[PDB]
Coordinates of C-alpha atoms and ligand atoms in Angstrom, one line a residue:
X1 CA -79.2 259.6 -38.3
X2 CA -79.0 256.4 -37.1
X3 CA -76.3 254.0 -38.4
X4 CA -77.6 250.1 -37.0
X5 CA -75.2 247.5 -36.3
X6 CA -72.2 249.8 -36.1
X7 CA -68.8 249.5 -34.4
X8 CA -69.3 249.2 -30.6
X9 CA -67.1 252.5 -30.0
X10 CA -69.6 254.4 -32.6
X11 CA -72.4 253.2 -30.6
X12 CA -70.9 254.1 -27.2
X13 CA -70.0 257.8 -28.1
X14 CA -73.7 258.4 -28.9
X15 CA -74.9 256.7 -25.8
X16 CA -75.4 257.3 -22.2
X17 CA -75.1 253.6 -21.6
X18 CA -73.1 250.5 -22.7
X19 CA -74.3 247.6 -24.6
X20 CA -76.0 249.0 -27.4
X21 CA -74.9 249.0 -31.5
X22 CA -76.6 251.8 -33.1
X23 CA -74.7 255.2 -33.8
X24 CA -76.8 258.0 -33.6
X25 CA -75.6 261.4 -35.1
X26 CA -76.4 264.4 -36.6
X27 CA -76.7 264.0 -40.4
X28 CA -74.5 267.3 -40.9
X29 CA -71.9 264.5 -40.0
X30 CA -68.7 266.9 -39.9
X31 CA -69.2 268.3 -43.4
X32 CA -67.1 271.4 -43.5
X33 CA -64.4 270.8 -41.1
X34 CA -61.3 269.1 -41.7
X35 CA -59.2 266.5 -39.7
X36 CA -55.3 266.2 -40.2
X37 CA -54.2 262.4 -39.3
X38 CA -50.6 262.5 -38.2
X39 CA -49.4 258.9 -38.7
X40 CA -48.2 256.2 -41.1
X41 CA -50.4 258.0 -44.0
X42 CA -53.8 257.1 -45.2
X43 CA -55.1 254.7 -48.0
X44 CA -56.8 257.3 -49.7
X45 CA -58.1 255.6 -52.6
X46 CA -60.1 253.4 -50.2
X47 CA -64.0 253.7 -51.2
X48 CA -64.7 254.0 -47.5
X49 CA -63.4 257.3 -47.5
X50 CA -65.5 258.3 -50.8
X51 CA -62.8 260.8 -51.9
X52 CA -62.7 262.7 -48.7
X53 CA -59.4 261.6 -48.1
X54 CA -55.8 263.0 -49.3
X55 CA -52.4 262.8 -48.4
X56 CA -51.1 266.3 -48.0
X57 CA -47.5 265.4 -46.7
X58 CA -44.7 262.8 -46.2
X59 CA -41.2 262.8 -44.6
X60 CA -40.3 259.6 -46.2
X61 CA -39.7 258.4 -49.7
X62 CA -43.5 257.9 -50.4
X63 CA -47.0 258.9 -49.1
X64 CA -48.2 255.6 -49.1
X65 CA -49.3 254.4 -45.8
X66 CA -47.3 250.9 -45.8
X67 CA -48.5 249.8 -42.2
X68 CA -52.2 250.4 -41.7
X69 CA -52.4 252.1 -38.6
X70 CA -52.8 255.7 -40.2
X71 CA -55.7 254.4 -42.3
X72 CA -57.3 252.8 -39.4
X73 CA -57.3 255.7 -37.3
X74 CA -58.5 258.2 -40.4
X75 CA -61.5 255.3 -40.7
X76 CA -62.2 256.0 -37.2
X77 CA -62.2 259.5 -37.5
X78 CA -64.3 259.7 -40.9
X79 CA -65.2 256.5 -42.7
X80 CA -68.6 256.2 -44.0
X81 CA -68.8 253.0 -42.2
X82 CA -66.6 253.1 -39.2
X83 CA -66.0 256.8 -38.8
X84 CA -67.6 259.6 -36.0
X85 CA -67.9 262.3 -38.6
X86 CA -68.6 260.8 -41.7
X87 CA -68.5 263.7 -43.8
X88 CA -65.5 265.7 -42.7
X89 CA -62.3 266.2 -44.8
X90 CA -59.3 263.6 -44.2
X91 CA -55.6 265.1 -44.4
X92 CA -52.8 262.5 -44.0
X93 CA -49.6 263.7 -42.8
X94 CA -46.8 260.6 -42.8
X95 CA -44.6 261.3 -40.1
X96 CA -44.5 257.5 -39.3
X97 CA -42.3 255.2 -41.2
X98 CA -44.1 251.7 -42.7
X99 CA -42.7 250.0 -39.4
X100 CA -44.9 252.5 -37.3
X101 CA -42.1 254.4 -35.9
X102 CA -40.6 258.1 -36.3
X103 CA -38.2 260.4 -35.1
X104 CA -39.2 263.5 -32.9
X105 CA -37.7 265.7 -35.3
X106 CA -39.8 264.5 -38.1
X107 CA -43.0 264.4 -35.7
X108 CA -42.1 267.8 -34.9
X109 CA -42.0 269.1 -38.6
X110 CA -45.3 267.3 -39.1
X111 CA -47.0 269.4 -36.3
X112 CA -45.6 272.8 -37.7
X113 CA -46.7 271.7 -41.1
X114 CA -50.2 271.4 -40.2
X115 CA -50.3 274.9 -38.5
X116 CA -49.4 276.3 -41.6
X117 CA -51.3 274.2 -44.2
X118 CA -54.4 274.4 -42.7
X119 CA -54.2 278.0 -44.3
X120 CA -54.2 276.1 -47.5
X121 CA -57.3 274.3 -47.1
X122 CA -60.6 275.1 -46.8
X123 CA -61.9 273.9 -43.2
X124 CA -64.9 276.8 -42.8
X125 CA -66.2 274.9 -39.5
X126 CA -63.0 274.4 -38.2
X127 CA -59.6 272.3 -38.0
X128 CA -58.6 269.1 -36.0
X129 CA -55.7 267.0 -35.7
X130 CA -55.5 263.6 -34.5
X131 CA -52.0 262.4 -33.4
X132 CA -52.0 258.4 -32.4
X133 CA -48.4 258.4 -31.7
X134 CA -45.9 259.4 -28.9
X135 CA -42.9 258.4 -26.9
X136 CA -40.9 259.6 -23.7
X137 CA -41.0 263.1 -22.5
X138 CA -39.8 265.8 -24.7
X139 CA -40.1 269.3 -24.1
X140 CA -39.8 270.1 -27.9
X141 CA -42.3 267.7 -29.0
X142 CA -44.8 269.0 -26.4
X143 CA -43.9 272.4 -27.1
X144 CA -45.0 271.8 -30.8
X145 CA -48.4 270.2 -29.8
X146 CA -48.8 273.4 -28.1
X147 CA -47.9 275.4 -31.0
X148 CA -50.5 273.4 -33.2
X149 CA -53.3 273.8 -30.5
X150 CA -52.4 277.7 -30.2
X151 CA -52.5 278.1 -34.3
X152 CA -56.3 277.1 -33.6
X153 CA -56.1 273.5 -34.2
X154 CA -58.1 271.2 -32.0
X155 CA -55.3 268.7 -31.3
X156 CA -56.4 265.3 -29.7
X157 CA -53.3 263.0 -28.5
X158 CA -53.2 259.5 -27.3
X159 CA -52.4 259.0 -24.0
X160 CA -49.9 256.0 -24.5
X161 CA -50.5 252.3 -23.8
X162 CA -48.0 251.6 -21.2
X163 CA -50.6 251.4 -18.0
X164 CA -48.5 254.5 -16.5
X165 CA -48.9 258.1 -16.0
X166 CA -49.1 259.8 -19.0
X167 CA -46.9 262.6 -17.6
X168 CA -43.6 260.8 -18.6
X169 CA -45.0 260.3 -22.3
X170 CA -45.1 262.9 -25.1
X171 CA -47.0 264.7 -26.8
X172 CA -49.7 263.3 -24.1
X173 CA -48.2 265.2 -21.1
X174 CA -48.7 268.4 -23.1
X175 CA -51.3 270.2 -21.0
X176 CA -53.1 272.4 -23.8
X177 CA -53.7 270.0 -25.7
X178 CA -56.6 267.1 -25.6
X179 CA -55.3 263.6 -24.0
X180 CA -57.1 260.7 -24.8
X181 CA -57.2 257.6 -22.9
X182 CA -58.9 254.1 -23.8
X183 CA -61.8 252.1 -22.7
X184 CA -63.4 249.1 -23.5
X185 CA -67.0 247.8 -24.6
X186 CA -67.8 247.2 -20.6
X187 CA -66.7 250.6 -19.6
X188 CA -63.5 249.4 -18.2
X189 CA -60.2 251.7 -18.5
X190 CA -58.4 249.6 -21.4
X191 CA -55.8 247.5 -19.6
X192 CA -52.8 249.1 -21.3
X193 CA -54.4 252.7 -21.1
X194 CA -52.2 255.5 -19.5
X195 CA -53.9 257.4 -17.1
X196 CA -53.2 260.6 -14.5
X197 CA -54.1 264.0 -14.0
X198 CA -53.0 265.2 -17.7
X199 CA -55.5 263.2 -19.1
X200 CA -58.7 264.9 -20.5
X201 CA -61.2 262.2 -21.7
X202 CA -61.5 258.5 -22.8
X203 CA -62.7 257.2 -25.9
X204 CA -63.0 253.5 -27.1
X205 CA -60.0 251.9 -27.6
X206 CA -60.1 248.2 -27.0
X207 CA -61.3 246.2 -30.3
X208 CA -62.0 248.8 -32.8
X209 CA -63.3 247.9 -36.3
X210 CA -61.9 250.3 -38.9
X211 CA -60.4 250.8 -42.5
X212 CA -57.0 249.2 -43.4
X213 CA -54.7 249.3 -46.1
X214 CA -55.3 247.1 -49.1
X215 CA -59.0 248.0 -49.2
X216 CA -59.7 246.2 -46.1
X217 CA -61.0 246.2 -42.4
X218 CA -59.8 244.9 -39.0
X219 CA -60.2 245.2 -35.3
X220 CA -57.2 246.6 -33.2
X221 CA -56.4 248.1 -29.6
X222 CA -54.8 251.1 -28.4
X223 CA -55.0 254.7 -27.2
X224 CA -54.3 255.1 -31.0
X225 CA -57.7 253.8 -31.6
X226 CA -59.3 256.0 -28.7
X227 CA -58.0 259.3 -30.1
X228 CA -59.7 259.5 -33.7
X229 CA -62.8 258.9 -31.8
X230 CA -62.4 262.1 -29.9
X231 CA -61.0 264.0 -33.1
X232 CA -64.1 263.0 -34.9
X233 CA -66.2 264.2 -32.1
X234 CA -64.6 267.5 -32.2
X235 CA -64.9 268.1 -35.9
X236 CA -68.8 266.8 -35.6
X237 CA -69.5 269.2 -32.9
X238 CA -67.7 272.1 -34.6
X239 CA -69.9 271.4 -37.6
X240 CA -72.9 272.0 -35.3
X241 CA -71.4 275.0 -34.1
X242 CA -71.4 273.9 -30.3
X243 CA -67.8 274.7 -30.2
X244 CA -64.5 275.7 -31.5
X245 CA -60.8 274.3 -31.9
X246 CA -59.8 276.6 -28.8
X247 CA -62.8 275.3 -26.6
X248 CA -63.7 271.8 -27.9
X249 CA -61.5 269.7 -25.3
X250 CA -63.2 271.2 -22.4
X251 CA -66.5 271.1 -24.2
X252 CA -65.9 267.4 -24.5
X253 CA -65.0 266.9 -21.1
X254 CA -68.2 269.2 -20.0
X255 CA -70.8 267.2 -21.9
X256 CA -69.1 263.6 -21.4
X257 CA -70.5 261.0 -19.6
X258 CA -69.3 261.2 -16.1
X259 CA -68.2 258.7 -13.5
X260 CA -69.5 255.4 -15.3
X261 CA -65.5 254.1 -15.9
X262 CA -64.1 251.1 -14.0
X263 CA -60.4 250.6 -12.9
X264 CA -59.8 254.3 -13.0
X265 CA -56.8 255.5 -10.6
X266 CA -57.7 257.9 -8.1
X267 CA -56.7 261.2 -10.1
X268 CA -57.9 260.3 -13.3
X269 CA -61.0 262.0 -15.2
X270 CA -64.0 259.5 -15.3
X271 CA -65.4 261.1 -18.2
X272 CA -66.2 259.3 -21.5
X273 CA -66.4 261.1 -24.9
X274 CA -70.4 261.4 -26.0
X275 CA -71.8 263.2 -28.9
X276 CA -75.2 264.4 -26.8
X277 CA -77.4 263.8 -29.8
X278 CA -80.9 263.9 -29.4
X279 CA -82.8 263.1 -32.6
Ligands
CA1 CA1 -55.2 268.7 -21.7

């Protein structure tokens, strides 16, 4: 399949080179996989989701995304126009309030919720979780992310936006998950992206067009935007049978575009997520 005039980040993850605008992907498009978006919620009624999105848990008085961030992330995972895995099922877990913040205890509870809830969902090709959140180092937050990954979910987490070593942030610093840095359309490390030996992969994170609340769209930037590109890529690859939840991060790193990013500090991977699709 070919989607012309796609958002630059979609075009980038199916290209060996920057500067193109068509997204190429196998038409299976993540069908039969599931992605949990653990964030501010998802505006499921948005047509871009085509009935494939649903809120499954909230820790607040409503399950509505009153912020937009979770809707944007979900859109990069799996919206029809802005998504990597255009046929995946999307499940929203609202651990962040409408101001975009959440207590670590609530975030931990939402991770444990996903580890159990996947047993209530039909995801024959596999389960992914996209965590575009984080704060300072917490061993409890890291151990919750580790449990989620151990349960058989491919966990993708944002590296953080501190232009610092991700070793000091959670869940970014949990070794066993897939920690995602951000790049821009000219293949630079995004100025704000964290770095360090705990990163597994980079994805597009600067000026990312996706869905927003009120049935709208907008471009925004962050490692929060890079993470759902990798989560959607994992779902896509698991539907194609190329990898499994336990192996997807390594598979993505093995098949990534290698050595092509600028402003990568010594000791940080220079790997950019790539779907290797050959039509
Ligand atoms: Ca890792």
